[PDB]
Amino acid sequence: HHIHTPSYIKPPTGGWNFTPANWKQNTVLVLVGFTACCVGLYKLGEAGSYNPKLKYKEEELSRWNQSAK
Amino acid sequence: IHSIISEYQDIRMYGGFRQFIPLAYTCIFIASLSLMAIPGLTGFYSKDIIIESMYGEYTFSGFIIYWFALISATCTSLYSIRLIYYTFLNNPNSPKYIYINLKENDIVLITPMIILTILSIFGGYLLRDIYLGMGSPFNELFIHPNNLSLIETEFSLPSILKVLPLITGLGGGLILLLIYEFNYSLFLVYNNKNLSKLYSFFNQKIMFDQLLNNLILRSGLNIGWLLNVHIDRGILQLFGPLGLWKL
Amino acid sequence: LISFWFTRFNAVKSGLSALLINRFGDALLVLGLSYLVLVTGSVNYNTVFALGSYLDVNMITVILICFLVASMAKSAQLGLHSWLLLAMEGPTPVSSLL
Amino acid sequence: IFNEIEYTYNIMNWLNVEYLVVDWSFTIDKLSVSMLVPVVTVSFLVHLY
Amino acid sequence: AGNPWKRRDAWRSQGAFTRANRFRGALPGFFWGLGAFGVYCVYEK
Amino acid sequence: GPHLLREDASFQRYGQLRDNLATYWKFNRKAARNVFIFLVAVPAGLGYLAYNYEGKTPFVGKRRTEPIFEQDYVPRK
Amino acid sequence: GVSELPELLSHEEMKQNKIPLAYRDRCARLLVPLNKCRKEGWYMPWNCVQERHDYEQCQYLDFKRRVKELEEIKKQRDAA
Amino acid sequence: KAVVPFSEANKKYVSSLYRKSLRTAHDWINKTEFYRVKASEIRSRFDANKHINDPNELKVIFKETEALLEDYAHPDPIIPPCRPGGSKFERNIPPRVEARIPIDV
Amino acid sequence: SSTPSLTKEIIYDRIVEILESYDNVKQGSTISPAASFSKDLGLDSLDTVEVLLELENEFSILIPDNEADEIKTVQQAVDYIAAQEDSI
Amino acid sequence: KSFLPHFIPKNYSYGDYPRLKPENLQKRDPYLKYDDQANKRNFNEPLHPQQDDLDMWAPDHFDFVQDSIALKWFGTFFGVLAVFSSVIYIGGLYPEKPANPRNYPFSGLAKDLGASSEEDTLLYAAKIDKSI
Amino acid sequence: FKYVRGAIVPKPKVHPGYVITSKFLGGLMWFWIFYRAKQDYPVWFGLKHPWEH
């Protein structure tokens, strides 16, 4: 068919149906990275998030409106 | 478009596809009916109430927009019928070698459509009370008390309006279907200069695209040219290098 | 996405038509935010919405007219809609998602 | 939507120019999650398609 | 002359493009959905 | 290096001309029509708006002292 | 079991129920059992049947109340 | 210029006006049965004036035939997708074949 | 299976389908790869362009005025169609 | 028909630069062979002084109808809706309300619409239900 | 393979993998439409009220 000039054109996204010979090996190295980070992102999400409707009770707000008055 | 081997997109080069790709046709059929707000579907339970609330506002603007919206519901029921017939029920326009080589697509391409079809049959009904519920707490959307007309939209509307979109929807659909099927000679519009002018205007999208480019964009680029000619290489060079060299 | 087939001349310019017309609204959206800082000194939801009634009616109009013009670009309403039908140069999945 | 709960992850501060303070804060109210169903659901099927 | 392609456009209206076939079941599963609906009257009543 | 560009004789004239428009420019009645608009007409028009409102816009924390909605209804019928 | 408009709530009651502003009216009292059930019923089209039906009829009477009170003003136009 | 009937170049002009005529009919008429009827007529309108031995008589028709097409031109002609103006024109052009001349920057 | 190419054999068997259904072909002078539209088959200037217009629709391409007038045989149609990227 | 876009000059004299009538390169026949097939230009062809406004990269030019005719059709179409909206407004053909606008208890929910005392009230109040 | 010259297009036989699926999918539509209609043809047209049982 046609020629991809693949000797030199090596963009990060491959180019023209690019697939490396050792693609099965690298994917498991990548599938770990997606799994490593998704698990990592779940930890931070639980630890660093909060509910912004329960930090202050209405009993505390009721003093704020009157104090500003 | 994937199935037809020529990968055409003009529905004037389609025809009689309903049996060679029955699965693709049904997805359009169920979706279009959901788009056209057939009773019991999902688009019905969301689009129809809006058309009522244009009239339920009982102001001048609500009345005028009511007909613009109602025409939109009408045209929706019309260009859908035009789209479905021209591509699935019409006399074939593509060559025969296309029809002998017309197949559906792989199972990976098929799965997403069927799943969206089911939502287009059941999604709207299940979710209706979550959003349109009478008094459901949704303070993220704030409605000032003097702007609530959901009560009068549902209780006070004339009994003929509640069916008006659908009656001109499918009832007007059949009439166009017959013309496209039995009496197509009416639509040979190139002979009629009134219809050709009308067809050209709306096919060219209100001539808005030509107005933008020929007038607005080019004038915007022209002001760049006049600044680039009479100012930057013009008066500033006269009161600059070229002018002072002459003096 | 719209100009994904960058070798195609039509897809290149239709991608530019989408970006420039949208940046028209984006300029108005920025101007709306500045009047939101000018009036309330904030762009938070918890703050600005808590002050809606107390603010001058003219000021809300200046902010929201800018929001409307920006929203006309993205939702492709009349006046800033020429790009919407030029967007079909992208692949069919792009049109479905966008 | 059903349990009347809200989530807010605040990564860090973005702008701190005198009174104008802006965070990299992400919240999920009823409306934010009312829009994440149409977005993520459709986009997942689009990618699968 | 007058339509020299008569024998060419024969198949655009014959075989699977006969008008009976073109509109044959254009409403997908009408009678299956219709047939089921009657049964729910039998099931409920 | 190796002159990796197929230089064009016509593009070079076009590039030569576009970078030397100052030479052929004249201060005819057309240029003054444009020059007046951009250097005087626009600056003065904006210069008036800038100075007219310079200090007349106390929009910081502006308050509302006038109702938005209407109270009583007066039907035509 | 609703046939006529019920008694209005009190100001303090709405605070504890956080009833939305646009629906703080005479029919607000029949809103609270409905809203509570929908939250426990996921706003489904079958888990709040009679509570929802009672409320819609309440808004009907609340709407039909204003119909008589709309015509009453229209007669006062005929005064002069 | 002048029009010389029965010359090869003059015939090709009439051939070109024929592709303009039938394609324009094809653009407006979207049913084959209706199209053949109108396409038959155009040829009859094209073949009735087949015999002309005069320059000036023929040039008026060329003036008229251009006007007939311009007023009847479709505002959205059908184009094959891979032909210029089509939906798939220039898509996925194979890259140019050429040697990379390295430069010592 | 997807669409299996378009080789000259399938091209030839479809052009003949055009001329067989076109009844303006002179009787006798069977459709042959060496035939001539005007000499053998018997078509005039306005007739040949009808065949060209039908041929370009059958193969879903657009033959420009420059090359359509160059095609004078049935083989030249086969060799012209085969040398195109959109002949489907 | 085949008209050139706006603001292209009729004449120009930039000294010794060649004079040539403007040609809208977007409208060249896409089937003819070119040295630069994408730009539809042949090598060493001269350029107009404003050739940047007359090529494939400039904004697309549409010549189906005259730029004046497009205004007539455009303004007429919205002009038609203007009379449809005007006559109803001038005639007052839109229907009257079938019920009184929705009223609200507790002084129109004045306090619940961000009011403090009874002096302002009407500033923040909704439609007052005076008919409890 | 070979192109058969001068033939009609017969009633195509696609795999009932696609045919049955489209029929069930379509049937799932209409059956739902009827099911809602019998229970909401009053309310849809406004001729009755939901609490008029």
Ligand SMILES: CCCCCCCCCCCCCCCCCC(=O)OC[C@H](COP(=O)(O)OCCN)OC(=O)CCCCCCCCCCCCCCCCC
């Ligand atoms: C952007 C912000 C501004 C930045 C720049 C600010 C300063 C710019 C000043 C611009 C003023 C000069 C520009 C216009 C003069 C151009 C000269 C010219 O065009 O030629 C006219 C003539 C030359 O004769 P000719 O060979 O025929 O050329 C004709 C070509 N049209 O020329 C003449 O006939 C002579 C004209 C009268 C000469 C009178 C001499 C009076 C004294 C000279 C002025 C001194 C200024 C400095 C003073 C302190 C110096 C120590």
Ligand SMILES: CCCCCCCCCCCC(=O)OC[C@H](COP(=O)(O)OCC[N+](C)(C)C)OC(=O)CCCCCCCCCCC
């Ligand atoms: C919120 C921030 C998100 C950032 C994440 C970035 C993901 C995308 C990376 C693309 C890399 C790539 O591959 O682009 C390079 C691609 C590769 O082409 P190819 O398909 O590999 O084929 C290869 C053969 N070509 C090249 C002949 C087709 O070609 C290009 O030069 C395309 C033009 C430049 C694209 C610039 C995109 C940059 C992303 C936007 C940055 C804000």
Ligand SMILES: CCCCCCCCCCCC(=O)OC[C@H](COP(=O)(O)OCC[N+](C)(C)C)OC(=O)CCCCCCCCCCC
């Ligand atoms: C208040 C604003 C102050 C801004 C700065 C001052 C103006 C800038 C002038 C640029 C000069 C220039 O361009 O010098 C270079 C220029 C000429 O150009 P060239 O390079 O030889 O090419 C162009 C030559 N041609 C025509 C052959 C192609 O030489 C001269 O004309 C020499 C005389 C210049 C005197 C400068 C006096 C400055 C006085 C300023 C107070 C009025």
